[PDB]
Amino acid sequence: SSWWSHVEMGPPDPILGVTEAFKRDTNSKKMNLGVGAYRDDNGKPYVLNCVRKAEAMIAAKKMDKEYLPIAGLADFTRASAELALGENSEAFKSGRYVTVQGISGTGSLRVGANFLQRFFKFSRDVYLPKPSWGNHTPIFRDAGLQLQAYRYYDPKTCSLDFTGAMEDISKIPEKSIILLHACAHNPTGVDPRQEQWKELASVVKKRNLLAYFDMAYQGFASGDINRDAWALRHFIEQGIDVVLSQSYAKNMGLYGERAGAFTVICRDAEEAKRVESQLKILIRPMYSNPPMNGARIASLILNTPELRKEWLVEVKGMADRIISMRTQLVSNLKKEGSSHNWQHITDQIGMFCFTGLKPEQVERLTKEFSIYMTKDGRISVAGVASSNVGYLAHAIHQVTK
Amino acid sequence: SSWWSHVEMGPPDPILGVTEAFKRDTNSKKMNLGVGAYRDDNGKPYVLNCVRKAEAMIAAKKMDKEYLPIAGLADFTRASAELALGENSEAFKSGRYVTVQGISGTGSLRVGANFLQRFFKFSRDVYLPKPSWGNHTPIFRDAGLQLQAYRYYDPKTCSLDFTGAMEDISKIPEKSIILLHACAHNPTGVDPRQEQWKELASVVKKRNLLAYFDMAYQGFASGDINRDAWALRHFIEQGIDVVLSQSYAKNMGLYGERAGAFTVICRDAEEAKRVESQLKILIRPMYSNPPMNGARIASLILNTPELRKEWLVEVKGMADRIISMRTQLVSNLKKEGSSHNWQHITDQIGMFCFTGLKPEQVERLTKEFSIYMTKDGRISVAGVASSNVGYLAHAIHQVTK
Ligand SMILES: Cc1[nH+]cc(COP(=O)(O)O)c(/C=N/C(CC(=O)O)C(=O)O)c1O
Ligand SMILES: Cc1[nH+]cc(COP(=O)(O)O)c(/C=N/C(CC(=O)O)C(=O)O)c1O
């Protein structure tokens, strides 16, 4: 009878745990399609070209390793806001925002959730869409907020349930908090259409809800950054002051470096100052100050003209390749002789495909084929290469035949 | 009347804020002695030699940037435990521990505090020593625990108040939590003597308190790592299962990289497994996974024989230099003609000196001399160089004369 005799065996993460299990398999044909991690055409981890150069520049300058301010590297912070907001933005121009370096997308999301728990005096409820990324639940839950839901996906039709979305949203009590995915909804891969977004704007405005945007995929939904930041920007110019979280984990392939940011759109630059003051005070007793490596790299990329442009060609290429795997998947499916309609695969955007397979099929997939994916039918098509798209298709077919 | 009109201007950090103010001064003779950051003999930031080499090795191998497990880089984790515990340790040998990468010392401390808040069913009180590092308060406080105190320093005598310490400790209710600094107490620079430590052990054992060790300075108290880990190790071999937090920020000069670790000494290796399981689940909705750069560097250093030995000569050198600045400070003081007894300066160990100056003197120091330090009289003697020890001494003298 020690201190921890009562502490039970908790279970492995529904997403991250997939990597653990996959690591242990001895099947040489094994594929890891759980976590959304981009792979090159050879099925290998990919460090962008522009990253490798930023690194080299950092190297040559012999930089120190001194602590960074509590709010992060200034230049990285100003650059992320600019990247979300667009340079011509009044909010940006006018200085009505505060952006603070965060521990990637998760980190930022949690700093924001914590901030809210502490200063958002009007409500303890966060409305997530059905379905949403597994991690959103616990991030909000450990921060001290309550979780709610709004209809989103319609599995019958493999699409956005606009009517239910609007119904639900039109009834959320005023002054509540709503989480919206900026683009490339995870895990459905289905986004609202522009016109649809204009409509959502109205209701949010109308009901006076705090819009919380999660932007983990800028440049992966269409291959264009500005285009992918459309909705977010439209909300702001309609007069909706949102809170926003950013990740550079996927779009810059900086996964383990942990670079990201959390932003608040305020009334003036004076309000922005006070908010800043309080966010610092939250972060201090959390981790004191943030990791410098991913922030140093990103800043250099974003702030260096040639590096920025190279990066944009690189994002396009990754997005394109994903499209090619989608196409090929479907086609092989037919070739294998599938009866089913696999149109959703090519219809969805981003890193994944919300396939539809049941959990018994997921089980067989891993066991007979050593293909690892999440139990909800989600697969990371980003981790598929030209050499194993055939293998994938064949399996999908066998277990579905 | 927006969302954040009620959010007030919070104040700057008592320690980190010193750097902000110092940055803004235009006096060319300015010195930053607030935060404990080591400076070379030229008053410049110092990236150890072994760090620069680890980096190069990382570079050449073309490593990826894939996400790391939720618990961190295995090799870094096993190596930190080994570093605290000593290779011959039964706890280490027997596998009764769990170590998890954390966001430096602060990060680890907070993961531990959070763990405790969640699983330490016997008490909500943490006993800090008087005085203790400013940040300990809020880290424990935001995690959800209550703060208590035990006598420690005696400003009359510039030393450890052993009698008060023991009194206080002998009365802490059983099953409470006590925070002890492993070595180089911050900010007093005064540690218990070995015999004193044996005595403390007994009472802790005796009262059945959870000992929480904060080890931010291994190798800075004496210049020897094993020697500096003595107390921690003695507690464990007496049968006290402690929780421990480590930072590699100072001893390896990895400040902004954010490398650190949190460890739990359990009953068996099976308990260790369950604890692990639960810690992962806490970290997941916090920041998902930890930064890789500082962990990659440290692992290489610790796990590579020649690198490890070089590192140990390097720690010795830094510790030695500090000693030389102490000596010189005192001596110049006399030369300037101080009447006061500045013996505490050479008596204390570690990065600082708990000088004794009052806040009016601290004020003048910054204003007439541009010498920045914390308001409690603490100065970072580590940030002093041969070229400005005279300048420092003279000021100290003027404002004290
Ligand atoms: C919507 C969303 N938000 C935040 C994140 C967190 O990213 P990061 O910067 O690494 O903390 C991710 C990552 N998505 C996945 C990775 C994961 O589960 O950690 C995924 O679905 O695989 C998201 O898909
Ligand atoms: C006792 C102690 N514990 C934990 C830490 C945190 O270290 P890190 O790995 O950077 O989170 C520090 C740093 N000490 C100082 C730095 C600070 O205040 O952030 C100091 O007293 O200057 C400590 O002195």
Side-chain angles (χ1 to χ4, degrees):
Chain A
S1 238
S2 344
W3 301 126
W4 326 111
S5 71
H6 55 124
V7 174
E8 310 175 332
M9 187 71 221
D13 193 71
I15 298 169
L16 260 24
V18 184
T19 298
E20 286 175 11
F22 155 96
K23 261 142 163 43
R24 288 201 306 264
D25 196 306
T26 77
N27 190 341
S28 50
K29 314 202 209 125
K30 77 178 166 165
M31 288 172 62
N32 178 198
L33 318 166
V35 50
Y38 179 91
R39 289 305 173 256
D40 80 354
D41 218 47
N42 289 314
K44 230 79 140 239
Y46 175 76
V47 185
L48 291 57
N49 266 292
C50 57
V51 165
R52 296 281 201 216
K53 308 182 215 216
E55 290 202 282
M57 303 190 183
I58 292 162
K61 324 209 268 195
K62 297 331 212 164
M63 313 177 88
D64 63 32
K65 291 201 189 291
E66 298 305 301
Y67 286 144
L68 254 34
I70 297 167
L73 179 54
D75 262 11
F76 160 77
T77 258
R78 181 194 50 261
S80 303
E82 191 189 50
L83 167 87
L85 270 10
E87 93 166 58
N88 57 114
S89 176
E90 175 271 335
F92 187 69
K93 260 43 208 182
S94 77
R96 323 152 40 182
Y97 68 97
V98 47
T99 304
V100 122
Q101 193 163 336
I103 298 171
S104 234
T106 303
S108 307
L109 236 24
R110 174 77 167 270
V111 155
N114 271 39
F115 181 61
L116 293 168
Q117 186 282 162
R118 171 176 307 173
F119 297 103
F120 195 69
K121 86 218 183 149
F122 324 89
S123 180
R124 301 291 65 175
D125 303 308
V126 185
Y127 281 79
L128 317 178
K130 312 180 82 149
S132 190
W133 180 47
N135 217 21
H136 283 133
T137 296
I139 279 155
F140 288 101
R141 216 214 268 119
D142 300 353
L145 303 174
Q146 278 264 323
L147 275 322
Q148 296 295 163
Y150 71 82
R151 294 167 273 186
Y152 190 79
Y153 190 72
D154 168 64
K156 267 166 269 218
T157 240
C158 301
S159 66
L160 186 60
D161 174 2
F162 209 58
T163 315
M166 297 293 268
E167 251 199 76
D168 287 353
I169 296 176
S170 70
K171 303 183 294 92
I172 283 159
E174 285 167 59
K175 289 186 195 246
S176 304
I177 312 160
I178 181 184
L179 191 131
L180 294 140
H181 299 220
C183 73
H185 178 264
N186 180 358
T188 80
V190 166
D191 296 333
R193 256 183 256 99
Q194 282 198 177
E195 318 97 47
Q196 293 190 310
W197 269 127
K198 296 177 200 254
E199 199 56 63
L200 279 151
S202 317
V203 187
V204 174
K205 175 66 171 167
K206 174 141 136 280
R207 315 272 316 155
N208 209 211
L209 323 166
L210 188 73
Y212 190 156
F213 282 85
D214 186 4
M215 207 151 72
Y217 305 94
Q218 182 185 17
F220 264 108
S222 71
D224 180 301
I225 60 154
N226 292 118
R227 152 124 321 172
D228 282 342
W230 191 90
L232 157 70
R233 302 176 176 178
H234 174 273
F235 281 51
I236 294 153
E237 93 174 5
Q238 284 294 106
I240 312 161
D241 294 352
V242 305
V243 295
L244 147 77
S245 147
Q246 301 157 92
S247 163
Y248 285 91
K250 309 99 169 9
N251 68 2
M252 282 186 184
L254 294 190
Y255 307 83
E257 299 276 356
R258 337 286 303 128
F262 168 83
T263 298
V264 186
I265 310 286
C266 312
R267 181 193 262 217
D268 311 48
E270 148 65 21
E271 191 158 81
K273 293 214 224 155
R274 308 177 258 118
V275 181
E276 155 91 307
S277 92
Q278 300 287 162
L279 270 174
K280 276 207 221 144
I281 272 163
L282 245 168
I283 292 161
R284 167 65 160 161
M286 232 178 287
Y287 55 81
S288 187
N289 53 84
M292 75 200 329
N293 212 232
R296 294 231 257 216
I297 303 183
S299 165
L300 234 14
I301 291 178
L302 294 189
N303 291 297
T304 312
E306 306 66 62
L307 279 176
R308 174 192 264 251
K309 48 119 165 133
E310 155 140 49
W311 174 52
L312 302 166
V313 176
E314 271 190 286
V315 177
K316 244 90 128 227
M318 300 195 283
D320 272 342
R321 202 196 72 88
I322 296 175
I323 289 161
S324 86
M325 298 291 110
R326 302 195 177 262
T327 280
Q328 283 193 81
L329 187 51
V330 161
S331 172
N332 278 110
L333 276 161
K334 306 207 186 89
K335 150 268 212 95
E336 295 282 335
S338 199
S339 258
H340 311 105
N341 176 8
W342 292 114
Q343 94 132 171
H344 47 298
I345 286 192
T346 44
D347 277 354
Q348 290 163 9
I349 41 157
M351 288 167 131
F352 326 89
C353 177
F354 208 38
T355 80
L357 308 166
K358 300 106 70 172
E360 302 69 40
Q361 308 164 136
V362 169
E363 205 164 282
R364 258 185 96 184
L365 244 352
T366 301
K367 169 167 6 181
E368 324 184 352
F369 296 96
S370 289
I371 291 172
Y372 295 70
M373 53 186 167
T374 60
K375 292 257 170 332
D376 54 5
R378 191 188 87 172
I379 77 150
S380 166
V381 83
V384 181
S386 308
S387 30
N388 55 26
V389 54
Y391 179 78
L392 182 46
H394 167 72
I396 300 202
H397 171 50
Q398 285 302 299
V399 140
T400 244
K401 197 190 82 99
Chain B
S1 238
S2 344
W3 301 126
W4 326 111
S5 71
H6 55 124
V7 174
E8 310 175 332
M9 187 71 221
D13 193 71
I15 298 169
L16 260 24
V18 184
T19 298
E20 286 175 11
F22 155 96
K23 261 142 163 43
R24 288 201 306 264
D25 196 306
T26 77
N27 190 341
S28 50
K29 314 202 209 125
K30 77 178 166 165
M31 288 172 62
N32 178 198
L33 318 166
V35 50
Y38 179 91
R39 289 305 173 256
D40 80 354
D41 218 47
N42 289 314
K44 230 79 140 239
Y46 175 76
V47 185
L48 291 57
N49 266 292
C50 57
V51 165
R52 296 281 201 216
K53 308 182 215 216
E55 290 202 282
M57 303 190 183
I58 292 162
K61 324 209 268 195
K62 297 331 212 164
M63 313 177 88
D64 63 32
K65 291 201 189 291
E66 298 305 301
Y67 286 144
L68 254 34
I70 297 167
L73 179 54
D75 262 11
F76 160 77
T77 258
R78 181 194 50 261
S80 303
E82 191 189 50
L83 167 87
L85 270 10
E87 93 166 58
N88 57 114
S89 176
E90 175 271 335
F92 187 69
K93 260 43 208 182
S94 77
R96 323 152 40 182
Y97 68 97
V98 47
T99 304
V100 122
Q101 193 163 336
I103 298 171
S104 234
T106 303
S108 307
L109 236 24
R110 174 77 167 270
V111 155
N114 271 39
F115 181 61
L116 293 168
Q117 186 282 162
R118 171 176 307 173
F119 297 103
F120 195 69
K121 86 218 183 149
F122 324 89
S123 180
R124 301 291 65 175
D125 303 308
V126 185
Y127 281 79
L128 317 178
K130 312 180 82 149
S132 190
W133 180 47
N135 217 21
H136 283 133
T137 296
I139 279 155
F140 288 101
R141 216 214 268 119
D142 300 353
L145 303 174
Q146 278 264 323
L147 275 322
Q148 296 295 163
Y150 71 82
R151 294 167 273 186
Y152 190 79
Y153 190 72
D154 168 64
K156 267 166 269 218
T157 240
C158 301
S159 66
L160 186 60
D161 174 2
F162 209 58
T163 315
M166 297 293 268
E167 251 199 76
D168 287 353
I169 296 176
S170 70
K171 303 183 294 92
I172 283 159
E174 285 167 59
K175 289 186 195 246
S176 304
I177 312 160
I178 181 184
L179 191 131
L180 294 140
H181 299 220
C183 73
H185 178 264
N186 180 358
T188 80
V190 166
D191 296 333
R193 256 183 256 99
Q194 282 198 177
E195 318 97 47
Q196 293 190 310
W197 269 127
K198 296 177 200 254
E199 199 56 63
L200 279 151
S202 317
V203 187
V204 174
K205 175 66 171 167
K206 174 141 136 280
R207 315 272 316 155
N208 209 211
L209 323 166
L210 188 73
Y212 190 156
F213 282 85
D214 186 4
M215 207 151 72
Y217 305 94
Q218 182 185 17
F220 264 108
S222 71
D224 180 301
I225 60 154
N226 292 118
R227 152 124 321 172
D228 282 342
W230 191 90
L232 157 70
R233 302 176 176 178
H234 174 273
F235 281 51
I236 294 153
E237 93 174 5
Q238 284 294 106
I240 312 161
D241 294 352
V242 305
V243 295
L244 147 77
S245 147
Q246 301 157 92
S247 163
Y248 285 91
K250 309 99 169 9
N251 68 2
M252 282 186 184
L254 294 190
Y255 307 83
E257 299 276 356
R258 337 286 303 128
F262 168 83
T263 298
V264 186
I265 310 286
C266 312
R267 181 193 262 217
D268 311 48
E270 148 65 21
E271 191 158 81
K273 293 214 224 155
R274 308 177 258 118
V275 181
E276 155 91 307
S277 92
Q278 300 287 162
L279 270 174
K280 276 207 221 144
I281 272 163
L282 245 168
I283 292 161
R284 167 65 160 161
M286 232 178 287
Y287 55 81
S288 187
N289 53 84
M292 75 200 329
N293 212 232
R296 294 231 257 216
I297 303 183
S299 165
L300 234 14
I301 291 178
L302 294 189
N303 291 297
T304 312
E306 306 66 62
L307 279 176
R308 174 192 264 251
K309 48 119 165 133
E310 155 140 49
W311 174 52
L312 302 166
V313 176
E314 271 190 286
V315 177
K316 244 90 128 227
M318 300 195 283
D320 272 342
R321 202 196 72 88
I322 296 175
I323 289 161
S324 86
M325 298 291 110
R326 302 195 177 262
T327 280
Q328 283 193 81
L329 187 51
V330 161
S331 172
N332 278 110
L333 276 161
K334 306 207 186 89
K335 150 268 212 95
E336 295 282 335
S338 199
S339 258
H340 311 105
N341 176 8
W342 292 114
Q343 94 132 171
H344 47 298
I345 286 192
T346 44
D347 277 354
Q348 290 163 9
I349 41 157
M351 288 167 131
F352 326 89
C353 177
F354 208 38
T355 80
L357 308 166
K358 300 106 70 172
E360 302 69 40
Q361 308 164 136
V362 169
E363 205 164 282
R364 258 185 96 184
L365 244 352
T366 301
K367 169 167 6 181
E368 324 184 352
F369 296 96
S370 289
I371 291 172
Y372 295 70
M373 53 186 167
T374 60
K375 292 257 170 332
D376 54 5
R378 191 188 87 172
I379 77 150
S380 166
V381 83
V384 181
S386 308
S387 30
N388 55 26
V389 54
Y391 179 78
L392 182 46
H394 167 72
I396 300 202
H397 171 50
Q398 285 302 299
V399 140
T400 244
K401 197 190 82 99

